[PDB]
RNA sequence: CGGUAACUACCCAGAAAGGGACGGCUAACUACGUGCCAGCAGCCGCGGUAAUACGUAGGUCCCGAGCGUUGUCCGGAUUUAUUGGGCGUAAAGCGAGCGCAGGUGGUUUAUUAAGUCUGGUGUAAAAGGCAGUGGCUCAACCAUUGUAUGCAUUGGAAACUG
RNA sequence: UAUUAGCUAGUUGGUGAGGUAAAGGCUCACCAAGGCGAUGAUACAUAGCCGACCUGAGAGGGUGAUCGGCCACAUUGGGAC
């Protein structure tokens, strides 16, 4: 019911995401619930802001991450806190 | 009507000294009291009296004059009219004349002045300035 | 001025009129009370240049476009500049303007148009009245 | 069950149903005074107990039926008619 | 001596018996730029008349406002008839925000900035009237602390 | 752009530090009204008379200098000319020609709007550049060795306040801004800004 | 989007500035056919013999890859004047009385805190301002980061009103 | 827009039943007659609304473009799984 996204937000050719915690109903530019983070992959680089708490909180409710939000949480520990947790 | 004696006491203080002459009138109240104590405590006037037992005592007060009976009191009126309770917040409450004026509103406290009424947070009703 | 007087007076205003009554031009579907998205044109019609009598005293003879107006209005609009080529069945772009010397008008013309030629080098902009910077 | 009004009823003859004036001054923004307006609210009578000059409060509850929004249940301020 | 600055040559006539007699005047300000402003009127046939005329009468009627640093007192008024100038001390010394015929006005008496509009007719004068009655209405904080009777400490 | 300076050179007669250059004889507008009389102005007329020195001395547009000038009229710390005439300075040709080595600005502007002087890794295209103080410029040697600037540029002078002159290597640091203590012309917030800015 | 912005070899000053405006009204007038003629114009207007009005060249006055024009709206306009009106004549006091609502309240004792002021609570996901950061360079603006809010509900105040 | 006066018949209460995810004339049956409204109810024109945004020093005026939210719609009208 619930995921975890990013945001296209940006240029031509300077785009920038921002991680927003969605459903599979939310528009992932539009309606929104409230976003967590701001993000840029390879500029400049592996630059990100992170809170780590209320992805806690819809991971106690249960979100889904995307790819690369996925694999930053990986590159976050709270995966191995789901380890912890298990 | 009887049912302004603040600024029909102003008004009156407008005629005593616009009028260069002695002594103005005022029934009996609390209020008036405060009127001539707070502003012939700011040096406007040079009386407190009243009629020693009526509740319409005439407040018959001397007037705190220049040099030559000359005006110290020129813009005098009452804010808040009879139609309308001014009821200002009490965080900002505004300057007068940048400075060079009185102010006076019945916080939830007292009926206090103007720097006393802007920075110890209190608010309430404006009264006067000059 | 009483409370309750001070309480029914609005802000409000009566003096409201925009000097372009405008069908402007437009998007003929079946009606055409369509209204209002004015234009500073008409891609529409008129019909003859007629001579206009100024005012007191200006003795002068000045050149209006008998003005095809479907919406019930003047059969005419000022015609600027020495000379017209048009004539009837043509289209007549619409300038918004007035001339008190000028009788009866609300419009002008726009002259210095799409169906207009003229004589460049004006000391006024070189290019109205059917003119452009001069290829030699 | 939570909220609260109060003032004279116009009509106190009908049958689980009643209404309210009320008093509320609210401003006016160019004349700065507030103004009082009376707002209506028939709702719930008990036994019909209707009388002139008392007042009932409302609940905010499940409506009765149409119309009848809150629940007039206790009529806290009682008067005597003249 | 002053700074001087003209204000307009007025249009006015004399209407003789067999015409018209072509009467001249004008209106002048002058002031050393540091609160001390006159204005002359010229009631002539000429222009150099109307100079002459203008220091006749722009030598008097030339007082000080009580300059607080190139500012004002504070906020005064100026009513008579038409002219109706409300000036306004603000943020000083960045723009001369003032109306035509009393920017002239305080450059010659030497405010930094004000903030002065004009309500019931720019009619010029009226506008020095009122402009006359707005360095008039100034009480100053030397005698809030003088002639009110107490020293107060919003000056000190 | 890169317009004559018959107004400033003639309906004022100082070409003022965006060229800095007093032209000779016939002082006047010439053609016609050149032999003929002089005119007047009014307080419009110097506002229109000191907008025209300050802007169109330097080399500046009216675009970029309303909407960079409103960009000077942002604060309000009581006076606002200090914010306005210290930004005549943060433009790198009016640097370097505070340098004194280019002639004009126009030259600095010419011959660093190039792409010549590579002021640390851009080539640069702007001489209009925003000027943060304490920073070097660095020069590129090709441009060091250009023979128009060999000619003028690289031919040093002398050099005003605020900077550090390299004349080895033609470079400079802005140490201090310049202001109303250092520059005056007649500047004036009430003729420009009373010109522009919501005329006021 | 791709040999993509960037960078070297940079070619020749050579390929790459025009538009509006000049009676004032606000800065920019003399050659100038005219002759109230044709025309120009937001207002005052003009042109009837040398018109800085116009056609007209030169000089100029402001701007720019945009100029100017009207079409809309805001301001000035306080021209509905709460801020920030007037009513004798210039527009205006009913043709005069009542006593319906409604409005306003002589003084004072105390309560009340309703309104009034203070604290907690809601507040635009945002985006947007006041600042800062980086950046398509620096530009402009974007990306970011805070700040700034009857959005609300709840303790206190009897100084005013109720 | 009161040159937009009297308006309202399931109207408004009560009981029952059907429905619904649910109190609820939500419906429907029956029995009661009220109620609204001259301090604007109905009828007519007009309108997607809001955050926001252009202008005004602000007060504000003005707009709802593009962006985001809600609402509504799917040649037209109406049903229903």
């Given at each position: 019911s619930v995921k975890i996204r990013l945001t296209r937000m940006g240029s031509k050719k300077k785009p920038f995401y921002r991680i927003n915690v969605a459903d599979s109903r939310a528009p992932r530019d539009g309606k929104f619930i409230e976003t967590v983070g701001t993000y840029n992959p390879l500029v400049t680089e592996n630059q990100v802001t992170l809170k780590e708490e209320r992805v806690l909180e819809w991971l106690s409710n249960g979100a889904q991450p995307s790819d690369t939000v996925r694999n930053l949480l990986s590159k976050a520990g709270v995966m191995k806190k789901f380890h912890e947790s298990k | 009507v009887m049912t302004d004696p603040i600024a029909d006491f102003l008004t009156r203080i407008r005629n005593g000294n616009m009028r260069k002459f002695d002594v103005v009138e005022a029934p009996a109240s609390k209020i008036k009291r405060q009127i001539a104590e707070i502003l012939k405590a700011e040096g406007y006037v040079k009386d407190v009296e009243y009629v020693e037992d009526n509740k319409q005592g005439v407040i018959r007060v001397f007037l705190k004059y220049g040099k030559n009976g000359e005006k110290v009191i020129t813009n005098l009126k009452r804010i808040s009219k009879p139609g309308l309770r001014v009821y200002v917040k009490s965080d900002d409450v505004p300057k007068v004349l940048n400075g060079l004026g009185t102010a006076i509103i019945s916080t939830s406290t007292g009926v206090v002045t103007d720097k006393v009424a802007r920075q110890t947070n209190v608010g309430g009703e404006v009264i006067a300035y000059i | 001025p009483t409370i309750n007087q001070l309480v029914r007076k609005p802000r409000r205003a009566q003096v409201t009129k925009s000097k372009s009554p405008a069908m402007n031009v437009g998007y003929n579907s079946r009606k055409?009370?369509?209204?209002?998205?004015?234009?500073?044109?008409?891609?529409?019609?008129?019909?003859?240049?007629?001579?206009?009598?100024?005012?007191?005293?200006?003795?002068?003879?000045?050149?209006?476009?008998?003005?095809?107006?479907?919406?019930?209005?003047?059969?005419?609009?000022?015609?600027?500049?020495?000379?017209?080529?048009?004539?009837?069945?043509?289209?007549?772009?619409?300038?918004?303007?007035?001339?008190?010397?000028?009788?009866?008008?609300?419009?002008?013309?726009?002259?210095?148009?799409?169906?207009?030629a003229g004589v460049a080098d004006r000391k006024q902009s070189r290019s109205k009245y059917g003119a452009k910077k001069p290829k030699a | 069950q939570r909220k609260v009004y109060q003032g004279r009823v116009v009509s106190d003859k009908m049958d689980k149903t009643i209404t309210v004036v009320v008093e509320t001054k609210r401003n006016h923004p160019v004349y700065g005074k507030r103004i009082n307006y009376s707002k209506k609210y028939k709702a719930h009578d008990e036994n019909n107990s209707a009388k002139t000059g008392d007042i009932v409060r409302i609940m905010e509850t499940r409506p009765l039926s149409k119309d009848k929004h809150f629940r007039l249940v206790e009529i806290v301020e009682e008067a005597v008619i003249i | 001596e002053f700074e001087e600055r003209v204000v307009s040559i007025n249009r006015v006539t004399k209407v003789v018996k067999g015409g018209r007699r072509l009467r001249f005047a004008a209106l002048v300000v002058v002031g050393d730029r540091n609160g001390r402003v006159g204005f002359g009127?010229?009631?002539?046939?000429?222009?150099?008349?109307?100079?002459?005329?203008?220091?006749?009468?722009?030598?008097?009627?030339?007082?000080?406002?009580?300059?607080?640093?190139?500012?004002?007192?504070?906020?005064?008024?100026?009513?008579?008839?038409?002219?109706?100038?409300?000036?306004?001390?603000?943020?000083?010394?960045?723009?001369?925000?003032?109306?035509?015929?009393?920017?002239?006005?305080?450059?010659?008496?030497?405010?930094?900035?004000?903030?002065?509009?004009?309500?019931?007719?720019?009619?010029?004068?009226?506008?020095?009237?009122?402009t006359v009655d707005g360095l008039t209405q100034l009480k100053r904080a030397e005698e809030v602390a003088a002639l009110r009777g107490k020293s107060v400490s919003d000056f000190a | 752009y890169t317009g004559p300076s018959w107004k400033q050179s003639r309906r004022y007669?100082?070409?003022?530090?965006?060229?800095?250059?007093?032209?000779?004889?016939?002082?006047?507008?010439?053609?016609?009204?050149?032999?003929?009389?002089?005119?007047?102005?009014?307080?419009?007329?110097?506002?229109?008379?000191?907008?025209?020195?300050?802007?169109?001395?330097?080399?500046?547009?009216?675009?970029?200098?309303?909407?960079?000038?409103?960009?000077?009229?942002?604060?309000?710390?009581?006076?606002?000319?200090?914010?306005?005439?210290?930004?005549?300075?943060?433009?790198?040709?009016?640097?370097?020609?505070?340098?004194?080595?280019?002639?004009?600005?126009?030259?600095?502007?010419?011959?660093?709007?190039?792409?010549?002087?590579?002021?640390?890794?851009?080539?640069?295209?702007?001489?209009?550049?925003?000027?943060?103080?304490?920073?070097?410029?660095?020069?590129?040697?090709?441009?060091?060795?250009?023979?128009?600037?060999?000619?003028?540029?690289?031919?040093?002078?002398?050099?005003?306040?605020?900077?550090?002159?390299?004349?080895?290597?033609?470079?400079?640091?802005?140490?201090?801004l310049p202001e109303r203590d250092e520059i005056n012309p007649e500047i004036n917030d009430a003729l420009i800004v009373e010109f522009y800015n919501k005329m006021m």
């Open positions: - | - | 055409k009370v369509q209204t209002k998205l004015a234009s500073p044109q008409k891609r529409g019609v008129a019909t003859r240049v007629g001579t206009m009598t100024p005012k007191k005293p200006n003795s002068a003879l000045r050149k209006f476009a008998r003005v095809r107006l479907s919406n019930l209005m003047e059969v005419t609009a000022y015609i600027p500049g020495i000379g017209h080529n048009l004539q009837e069945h043509s289209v007549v772009l619409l300038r918004g303007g007035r001339v008190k010397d000028l009788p009866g008008v609300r419009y002008h013309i726009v002259r210095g148009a799409l169906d207009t | - | 009127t010229g009631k002539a046939q000429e222009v150099p008349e109307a100079i002459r005329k203008a220091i006749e009468a722009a030598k008097k009627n030339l007082i000080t406002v009580p300059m607080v640093g190139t500012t004002l007192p504070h906020e005064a008024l100026g009513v008579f008839g038409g002219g109706k100038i409300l000036l306004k001390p603000a943020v000083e010394g960045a723009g001369v925000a003032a109306g035509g015929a009393v920017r002239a006005v305080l450059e010659l008496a030497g405010v930094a900035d004000v903030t002065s509009k004009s309500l019931g007719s720019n009619t010029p004068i009226n506008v020095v009237r009122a | 007669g100082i070409s003022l530090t965006g060229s800095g250059k007093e032209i000779a004889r016939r002082n006047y507008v010439p053609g016609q009204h050149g032999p003929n009389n002089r005119s007047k102005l009014s307080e419009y007329g110097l506002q229109l008379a000191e907008k025209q020195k300050l802007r169109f001395t330097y080399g500046l547009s009216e675009r970029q200098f309303r909407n960079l000038y409103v960009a000077a009229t942002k604060v309000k710390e009581g006076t606002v000319g200090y914010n306005f005439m210290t930004l005549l300075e943060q433009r790198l040709d009016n640097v370097v020609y505070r340098l004194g080595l280019a002639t004009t600005r126009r030259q600095a502007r010419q011959f660093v709007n190039h792409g010549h002087i590579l002021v640390d890794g851009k080539r640069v295209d702007i001489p209009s550049f925003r000027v943060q103080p304490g920073q070097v410029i660095s020069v590129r040697e090709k441009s060091m060795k250009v023979p128009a600037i060999l000619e003028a540029v690289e031919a040093t002078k002398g050099r005003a306040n605020f900077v550090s002159f390299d004349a080895d290597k033609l470079e400079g640091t802005l140490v201090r």
